[PDB]
Amino acid sequence: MAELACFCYPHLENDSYKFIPFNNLAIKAMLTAKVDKKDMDKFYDSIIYGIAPPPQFKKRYNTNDNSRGMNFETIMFTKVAMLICEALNSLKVTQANVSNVLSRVVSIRHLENLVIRKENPQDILFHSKDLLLKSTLIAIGQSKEIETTITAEGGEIVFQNAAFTMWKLTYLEHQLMPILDQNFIEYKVTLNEDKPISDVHVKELVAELRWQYNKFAVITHGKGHYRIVKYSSVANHADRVYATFKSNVKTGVNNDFNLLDQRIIWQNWYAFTSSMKQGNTLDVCKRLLFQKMEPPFKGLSTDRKMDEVS
Amino acid sequence: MAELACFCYPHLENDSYKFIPFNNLAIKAMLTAKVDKKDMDKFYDSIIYGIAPPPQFKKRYNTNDNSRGMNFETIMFTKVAMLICEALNSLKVTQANVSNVLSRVVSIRHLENLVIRKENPQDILFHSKDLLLKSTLIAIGQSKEIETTITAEGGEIVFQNAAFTMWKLTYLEHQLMPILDQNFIEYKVTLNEDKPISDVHVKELVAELRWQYNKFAVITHGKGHYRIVKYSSVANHADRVYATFKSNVKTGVNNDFNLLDQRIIWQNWYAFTSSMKQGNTLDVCKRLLFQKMEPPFKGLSTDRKMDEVS
Amino acid sequence: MAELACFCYPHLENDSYKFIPFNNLAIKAMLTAKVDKKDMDKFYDSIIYGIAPPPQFKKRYNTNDNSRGMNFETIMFTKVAMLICEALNSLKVTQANVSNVLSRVVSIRHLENLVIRKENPQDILFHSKDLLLKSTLIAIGQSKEIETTITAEGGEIVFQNAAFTMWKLTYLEHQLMPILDQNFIEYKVTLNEDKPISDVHVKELVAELRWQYNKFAVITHGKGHYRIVKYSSVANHADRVYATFKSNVKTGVNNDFNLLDQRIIWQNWYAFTSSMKQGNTLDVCKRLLFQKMEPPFKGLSTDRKMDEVS
Amino acid sequence: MAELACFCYPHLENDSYKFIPFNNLAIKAMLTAKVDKKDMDKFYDSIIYGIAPPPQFKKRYNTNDNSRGMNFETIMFTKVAMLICEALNSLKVTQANVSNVLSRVVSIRHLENLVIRKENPQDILFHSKDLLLKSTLIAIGQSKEIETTITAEGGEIVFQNAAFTMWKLTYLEHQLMPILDQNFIEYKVTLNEDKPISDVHVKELVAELRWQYNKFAVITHGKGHYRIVKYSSVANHADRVYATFKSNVKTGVNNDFNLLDQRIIWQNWYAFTSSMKQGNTLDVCKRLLFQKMEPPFKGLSTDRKMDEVS
Amino acid sequence: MAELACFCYPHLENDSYKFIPFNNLAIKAMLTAKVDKKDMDKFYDSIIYGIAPPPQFKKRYNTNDNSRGMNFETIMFTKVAMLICEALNSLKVTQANVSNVLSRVVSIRHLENLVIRKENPQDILFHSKDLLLKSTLIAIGQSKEIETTITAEGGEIVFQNAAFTMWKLTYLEHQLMPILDQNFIEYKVTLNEDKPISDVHVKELVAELRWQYNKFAVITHGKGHYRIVKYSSVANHADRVYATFKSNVKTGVNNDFNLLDQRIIWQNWYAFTSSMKQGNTLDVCKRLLFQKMEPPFKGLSTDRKMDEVS
Amino acid sequence: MAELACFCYPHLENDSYKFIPFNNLAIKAMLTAKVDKKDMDKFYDSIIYGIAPPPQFKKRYNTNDNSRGMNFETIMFTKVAMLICEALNSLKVTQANVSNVLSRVVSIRHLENLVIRKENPQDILFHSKDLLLKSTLIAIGQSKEIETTITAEGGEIVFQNAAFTMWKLTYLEHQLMPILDQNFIEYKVTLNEDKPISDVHVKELVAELRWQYNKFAVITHGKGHYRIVKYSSVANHADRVYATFKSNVKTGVNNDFNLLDQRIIWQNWYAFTSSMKQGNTLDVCKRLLFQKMEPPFKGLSTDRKMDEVS
């Protein structure tokens, strides 16, 4: 969604790098500037409003002629920028790394959701700076830890178990970078703890997903939680995860992929992703997606049905 | 929902009975009137606003202390009343029958929907008085004919086949007697013609109902069309149909019941209703409703799924 | 409330007097005019907008400095004027009488209510010009007939009997000359027919008046119907009726007074008015109003009570 | 209206139990949760929003499919919860009792009214924490003291005496759990002090109740104040008080009942309740309610009448 | 923008084909229908709302999941449909041709503009059915005649000459199929007559275009008028015209192209299009577009400048 | 736009003059006052609201009969007054000078823009009192320094270079003294630093001005920055600058004039102003304005064009 350099810039004071949010009028000035090709990757001095992002990220910002960026003039842009700065400032980043850290692309919608979590007095993140930092570092790609319920990006809870918390992603209502397609619906299921889950608690989740979300495929991107996406979108999900798997192999970055419970994941998605982890090609993997198959917890849908009839 | 006498009264002119709509201020005057117990079943003379319904039907009309009636002061009350009068006036009803005809209870919501159909220049009923009369006579219980797509009460079309037309019932938005429970959702599937339906056209309907309405039971009330109701409501439907079957037996009125296609109807509903037609008791019939069973078109849900994934 | 000359003027065409409504801009011009004392009682020629009422009636019209008149610029002024003209035009008034007819003071609020009745397709007056004329002639003081339910000024029906129709007077919502005191509440009870009324139908009315209007006195002005007025106002009613009785004696005009049913009228009002008809003085009559007395249908209030408890 | 456990949960810190209000998002999470039958009576851990009420109280909370509960997402829910917690926290409740204390059902509308009293700088409760605690403990069922004017739940004062304060209950306008029937009207009359009341001060109250509330029955529930309820509702009041009297006998809880002044209470209610205290059956008691009788302060209604006529 | 079959269907009555507009509820029903692959190109019978377009044109209609179609539920859809039907009905189309006529793709925005012209009493098209037919037949591709000012699609006149009329295209404000990109600006310059144009009248147009539209390229699509498009869009225009030139060659349809005045057209566009007419390839033509060149009416921009300074 | 005495008055406390803002009700009182001709130039004592400006400046203030002044009752009047007072209070003005300082006419719109700059946390002036003072002293005519980008009056940045910052003047939206002509558009180009500017950075600015502002003349008033004004206004600009040049010569005040870069300034303006500096008459100077001439960076407009076509 955007590189971290779209929100802040590094400032060396006291043999350590502190990160500072952009003023939105500085971004606005940048968008109107004539800049040499040699300077497109350098931070821009607006003179009146402080420093601004490198003009090379111009398309990340919505303008009269760009709707595929972010709304950098909203309050949420500043809140997201401050959330990034706080997390990155706790890391005492060193001179060799600042470039890699800022050039990293992160999910803006994940960050706006964490803002929404932390500003809510009811939410644990409002009351624990440690959990907020952990949660943010995960979304910034500066942590090895896995996103769980405690550290979830958030949303509206629509189902909860001893083992699982199902959330509805509210991206349509975001201020910074909302999803523009009004047909969008996506959920995620995060794990509450990391100790083994009983068959009965798996059953309960599977049963809810077949009754209340029968038109949704249960998939994962390998990062330790389930993604509940409409079947009309799994093919696009497959492309993205494969491209991400392929790239992370070429670049040597961490590339472990948690296929998660085969009793829960859509069987075609399990096939597709298991073929990925085996090193197969895109065309070979994607074929298992569209290949019909039928070999699960039998009779779970008819249980919820009769419960309702009573 | 209400007896026909709640909308019109009979007037003998020219050796034939013409039916006349009530003024709503006549109803209002009636609701404030002191009436002898002997006159509760007689039409009421408001003096200023003409005749009014028998005070015995007071509860059919919404007031400060009644919300289970109709909104007789709306324009829709008059349109519905005129629709009834037109249909009943084409029948040259005779002196012995007027009582039975008016005392008959009909669905107001069905009549408001027929009004909505006929006032729409796009709808065939707007352009054929014969079809409108047929359609209304069915809803008034003064016709032996079966409601089909052509003569359907109406609603929003949400699926259509060579053989079927699926409608969404808009009762939440009615003016005269809307459903007050905002959780209400109900569809009906009417037959387009009365010649046999191919297996493939049945398949197409069943497939849509499992994909798009998996949380809905396919039942019928025996009147020749399907009713798509949430499982949380089939038990109440069962009570009503049985009470109607029981009564129509005691009173000798027509009591044929079309169970419709067993490949479409929910198997528990087919069992429940087949036990009814065999003369069983309520407790025996209703038991087959809650009795779990599992012995259909196999693999039809997985067909639509893969179609979407493409 | 206003003389008839405030609404129309006489025009002699074809040896008969036709009456013509004023344009409101003609009235407005009149209100700004300098007029000789000798011409204050003559109709005024606005030149641009036709004839206008005699400047002597200036205070009948609301202005920046008068709120005790009528709102002669509303549509209702024209409707009321036309209603008067129609009634007076059916009388072929003669040259000697026009002065007396126009100088007569009538109730504007009664006339606005008759307009409201006749413009309503539900009301009998909408469909019978004869009843409308009769009803208007009563309110214009050009008829010997008594106002009954059929010819009532109107309002909201709040109770109805075989013998009685109780109306709520809506004067607070009038456009032409509303009551300005927002605490105003007044009802009237008109007789449906003029044949004798049974004890049971009297009982029913008395019972309603004690239960639902316990804070209201049942009085009459002698014109053949009951007036339901709050006790805080009967003394003012007494003054007005006496002044009207006194005047009608001095002027020889008709002065019969129908005391109506002593089982219904408030006993103090019956005493007050019976003393009037006997020729007593104001001070003697009014004393019987404030004189406490207690000598009715016993136990009628406790009947309605227990009915409600059930 | 709801058990205290619907608002707070107990926390053992420092050998004493402190009570903590629920976050409304914790309640919301609970309402979506799959819970074992064995855990339905245990407080629920929403993980993200803290603890929540036992899922067994699900129906106390309004949802898309429940309107007979409370609006737990309003600000008033939190204010009411804090009011309960403050009162219960002053009691140093012990481990054996917490269950009984929380399981106790209290009037939410009484608690919302006490909130409205205490937040008003004009009200004595705003300025005396001791009176507020006393007043709340009465409404929580954790006090032996009787509700008087000082500690009344509140409302709009509509009549006041040396001995009495009459209040109108504003339940239609409540935010947390309003009465939904718009025809609802109920008053209460609380005693200002507990020393004897003169006949003249009783007379004054009775006189107001007959003039201004003639359609209302003067009853009590035995808790030391009068309840002014429409006659159309006394039968339902009778059922509730008897069921409460019956239960409190079976459970041994305090069951004294103050019949209050027989010159004020509706004579049928006095009969009904006196039969209750004598141990009679429901059918025997309730019969005295509908039994007509007529054997009071004579001529008090005619005093207020003549006062108004002046 | 859409085939003519998206608006009407043919009906053989009286050995001639009359064309009939679709009801929008018929289209809506079609969009929900299950249709055999063999019938996708056949007109669809909605049963309740008449005939509908072939389901193969589903994407021409805006839905919850399609924004690249038209708003067929607006009034403008019906007006456009009637305009097409009127024009096509004057042609007595024969059985062999109906398919070709309906399958023809036309500009909806051109048709909505002609509607706007004809409904305006000020516009000549409102008063001449012959001119309207001519104008529509041009936009329907059923006429050999060239669009001139008289028969222009319309818009806001922003400049006019003895020889030229410049219009602003209002596509952003259209109801049926507006341009969605809010940055859109496009003008057209139509010829008033077809007799030769003096150098001075060309000068006047060129002068206005350089002063008031310096950021716009003067191009044509070969149909006899100028198109004033921003330079940021000429490359896309080039693609479309070439694809249209290429296709019309392969299909043998009329393919004459009027390059128009080389003193007016942007020199790069003249080069690009002259290379097209010579049969060159796309890559060869398009190269002349981006090839810088500079060899016009000298000093025309400085004339308007000094005029303004005065 | 107004003398400084329209905003504040001098107060001698502690052998130094402090300047105090006017209350707007003091101004209002002054505007209603009868004042001797001898006192028209003295500050006015409103008695109730403090001191007010000399009645001789009455026309500087908008009233029912004056629209060519300022809106002295807005909040902006007070902010501007305080900004002046702060700047003037840092100068320890002496007794001989106060008259000259206050009588000085300054641009109100410049001062309102500096307020808008300083109240914005994003703007450097918000964070540096020294820069704000410098910037204000320039606008007050109490500084020898030249307005640069850092100290610019402000506006919306529409173009920025290593060497230049182009601003749009928002005078239409001002609160204190907006431009009333809605056709007004004016920009200014300020220099970022005062070290020499490369040819390439000049080229970049000239290129933007020809593409995006072709209808605007590049002129200066000699104060060290460029003014981008429509050609329809340069003649009026010429009058004003000449009158200012003429006056400053007669009064001996500073009269240096920076013609700025002849490669940027409109050649006619350079001629006009160079003739001014040579001492020529108005008629001689102004003639060079309207005199056509054509002898610049060739082919710069065609560079931006082709860039857009790509």
Side-chain angles (χ1 to χ4, degrees), chain E residues 54-224:
Chain E
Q56 90 192 103
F57 300 127
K58 253 174 154 103
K59 277 309 189 132
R60 303 300 199 179
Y61 302 107
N62 288 337
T63 57
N64 282 316
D65 67 334
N66 183 21
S67 72
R68 291 182 285 216
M70 61 175 111
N71 301 293
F72 66 97
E73 298 194 89
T74 62
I75 304 271
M76 189 51 74
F77 168 87
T78 308
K79 294 180 176 178
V80 166
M82 279 158 177
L83 186 72
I84 296 171
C85 281
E86 198 172 7
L88 283 178
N89 280 339
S90 70
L91 290 175
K92 74 161 275 222
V93 178
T94 78
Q95 176 147 347
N97 299 327
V98 303
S99 46
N100 163 257
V101 172
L102 293 178
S103 66
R104 164 153 209 130
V105 174
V106 300
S107 172
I108 289 172
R109 298 189 262 261
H110 193 141
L111 299 185
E112 163 158 358
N113 264 334
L114 282 175
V115 171
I116 290 157
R117 281 199 65 199
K118 88 160 218 151
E119 299 201 321
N120 191 346
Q122 302 186 56
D123 192 305
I124 49 172
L125 291 191
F126 182 99
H127 297 280
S128 169
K129 268 290 189 232
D130 252 346
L131 276 173
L132 173 66
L133 258 292
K134 273 167 204 176
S135 295
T136 300
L137 288 173
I138 288 166
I140 283 320
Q142 282 297 136
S143 168
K144 258 318 224 172
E145 296 300 316
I146 290 313
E147 182 188 357
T148 69
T149 294
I150 286 296
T151 54
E153 74 173 281
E156 271 141 35
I157 297 185
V158 296
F159 168 86
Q160 195 170 62
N161 220 2
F164 305 105
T165 292
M166 189 161 160
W167 318 73
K168 182 196 162 119
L169 301 173
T170 54
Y171 293 159
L172 281 177
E173 302 134 77
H174 273 200
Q175 150 159 84
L176 186 48
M177 217 193 149
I179 289 281
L180 307 185
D181 172 19
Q182 297 308 289
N183 292 303
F184 172 84
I185 307 192
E186 191 175 321
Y187 311 80
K188 74 156 65 180
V189 185
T190 52
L191 280 60
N192 294 344
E193 308 154 275
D194 78 336
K195 70 188 81 193
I197 304 166
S198 68
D199 294 352
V200 56
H201 288 158
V202 173
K203 204 148 100 52
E204 281 166 353
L205 172 63
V206 174
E208 176 76 11
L209 292 166
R210 286 182 199 170
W211 173 255
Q212 194 65 44
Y213 310 92
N214 81 294
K215 311 186 282 134
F216 289 80
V218 185
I219 70 162
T220 182
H221 284 198
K223 315 272 218 304

Side-chain angles (χ1 to χ4, degrees), chain A residues 24-25 28 62 70-78 176:
Chain A
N24 60 42
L25 289 183
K28 225 183 173 71
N62 288 337
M70 61 175 111
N71 301 293
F72 66 97
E73 298 194 89
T74 62
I75 304 271
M76 189 51 74
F77 168 87
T78 308
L176 186 48

Side-chain angles (χ1 to χ4, degrees), chain A residues 99-196:
Chain A
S99 46
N100 163 257
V101 172
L102 293 178
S103 66
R104 164 153 209 130
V105 174
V106 300
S107 172
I108 289 172
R109 298 189 262 261
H110 193 141
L111 299 185
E112 163 158 358
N113 264 334
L114 282 176
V115 171
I116 290 157
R117 281 199 65 199
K118 88 160 218 151
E119 299 201 321
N120 191 346
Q122 302 186 56
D123 192 305
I124 49 172
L125 291 191
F126 182 99
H127 297 280
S128 169
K129 268 290 189 232
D130 252 346
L131 276 173
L132 173 66
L133 258 292
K134 273 167 204 176
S135 295
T136 300
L137 288 173
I138 288 166
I140 283 320
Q142 282 297 136
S143 168
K144 258 318 224 172
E145 296 300 316
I146 290 313
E147 182 188 357
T148 69
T149 294
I150 286 296
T151 54
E153 74 173 281
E156 271 141 35
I157 297 185
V158 296
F159 168 86
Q160 195 170 62
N161 220 2
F164 305 105
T165 292
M166 189 161 160
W167 318 73
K168 182 196 162 119
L169 301 173
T170 54
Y171 293 159
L172 282 177
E173 302 134 77
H174 273 200
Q175 150 159 84
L176 186 48
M177 217 193 149
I179 289 281
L180 307 185
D181 172 19
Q182 297 308 289
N183 292 303
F184 172 84
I185 307 192
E186 191 175 321
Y187 311 80
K188 74 156 65 180
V189 185
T190 52
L191 280 60
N192 294 344
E193 308 154 275
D194 78 336
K195 70 188 81 193

Side-chain angles (χ1 to χ4, degrees), chain F residues 22-232:
Chain F
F22 298 129
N23 288 330
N24 60 42
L25 289 183
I27 297 165
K28 225 183 173 71
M30 186 279 287
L31 295 163
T32 81
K34 189 76 188 67
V35 184
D36 294 343
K37 296 183 128 295
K38 95 201 193 62
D39 297 315
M40 293 296 286
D41 63 343
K42 301 183 185 58
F43 292 101
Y44 178 86
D45 184 359
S46 80
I47 299 172
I48 295 292
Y49 302 110
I51 306 291
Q56 90 192 103
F57 300 127
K58 253 174 154 103
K59 277 309 189 132
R60 303 300 199 179
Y61 302 107
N62 288 337
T63 57
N64 282 316
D65 67 334
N66 183 21
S67 72
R68 291 182 285 216
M70 61 175 111
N71 301 293
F72 66 97
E73 298 194 89
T74 62
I75 304 271
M76 189 51 74
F77 168 87
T78 308
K79 294 180 176 178
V80 166
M82 279 158 177
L83 186 72
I84 296 171
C85 281
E86 198 172 7
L88 283 178
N89 280 339
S90 70
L91 290 175
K92 74 161 275 222
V93 178
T94 78
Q95 176 147 347
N97 299 327
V98 303
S99 46
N100 163 257
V101 172
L102 293 178
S103 66
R104 164 153 209 130
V105 174
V106 300
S107 172
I108 289 172
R109 298 189 262 261
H110 193 141
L111 299 185
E112 163 158 358
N113 264 334
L114 282 176
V115 171
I116 290 157
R117 281 199 65 199
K118 88 160 218 151
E119 299 201 321
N120 191 346
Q122 302 186 56
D123 192 305
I124 49 172
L125 291 191
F126 182 99
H127 297 280
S128 169
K129 268 290 189 232
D130 252 346
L131 276 173
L132 173 66
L133 258 292
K134 273 167 204 176
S135 295
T136 300
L137 288 173
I138 288 166
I140 283 320
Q142 282 297 136
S143 168
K144 258 318 224 172
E145 296 300 316
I146 290 313
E147 182 188 357
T148 69
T149 294
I150 286 296
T151 54
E153 74 173 281
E156 271 141 35
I157 297 185
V158 296
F159 168 86
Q160 195 170 62
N161 220 2
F164 305 105
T165 292
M166 189 161 160
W167 318 73
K168 182 196 162 119
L169 301 173
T170 54
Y171 293 159
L172 282 177
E173 302 134 77
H174 273 200
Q175 150 159 84
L176 186 48
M177 217 193 149
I179 289 281
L180 307 185
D181 172 19
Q182 297 308 289
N183 292 303
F184 172 84
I185 307 192
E186 191 175 321
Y187 311 80
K188 74 156 65 180
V189 185
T190 52
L191 280 60
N192 294 344
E193 308 154 275
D194 78 336
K195 70 188 81 193
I197 304 166
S198 68
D199 294 352
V200 56
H201 288 158
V202 173
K203 204 148 100 52
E204 281 166 353
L205 172 63
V206 174
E208 176 76 11
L209 292 166
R210 286 182 199 170
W211 173 255
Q212 194 65 44
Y213 310 92
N214 81 294
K215 311 186 282 134
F216 289 80
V218 185
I219 70 162
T220 182
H221 284 198
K223 315 272 218 304
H225 61 273
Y226 301 96
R227 308 191 183 221
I228 318 299
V229 309
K230 19 177 70 162
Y231 285 97
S232 73

Side-chain angles (χ1 to χ4, degrees), chain A residues 210-216 231-235 266 268 289-294 299 301-303 305-306 308-310, chain B residues 210-216 231-235 266 268 289-294 299 301-303 305-306 308-310:
Chain A
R210 286 182 199 170
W211 173 255
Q212 194 65 44
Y213 310 92
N214 81 294
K215 311 186 282 134
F216 289 80
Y231 285 97
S232 73
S233 85
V234 316
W266 186 42
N268 289 69
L289 257 195
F290 314 109
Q291 165 166 82
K292 166 135 40 183
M293 33 178 103
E294 177 269 324
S301 211
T302 85
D303 266 18
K305 264 182 199 195
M306 301 290 335
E308 294 269 347
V309 172
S310 309
Chain B
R210 286 182 199 170
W211 173 255
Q212 194 65 44
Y213 310 92
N214 81 294
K215 311 186 282 134
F216 289 80
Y231 285 97
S232 73
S233 85
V234 316
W266 186 42
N268 289 69
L289 257 195
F290 314 109
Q291 165 166 82
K292 166 135 40 183
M293 33 178 103
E294 177 269 324
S301 211
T302 85
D303 266 18
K305 264 182 199 195
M306 301 290 335
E308 294 269 347
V309 172
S310 309

Side-chain angles (χ1 to χ4, degrees), chain D residues 197-234:
Chain D
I197 304 166
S198 68
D199 294 352
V200 56
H201 288 158
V202 173
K203 204 148 100 52
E204 281 166 353
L205 172 63
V206 174
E208 176 76 11
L209 292 166
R210 286 182 199 170
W211 173 255
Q212 194 65 44
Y213 310 92
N214 81 294
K215 311 186 282 134
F216 289 80
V218 185
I219 70 162
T220 182
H221 284 198
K223 315 272 218 304
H225 61 273
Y226 301 96
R227 308 191 183 221
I228 318 299
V229 309
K230 19 177 70 162
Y231 285 97
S232 73
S233 85
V234 316

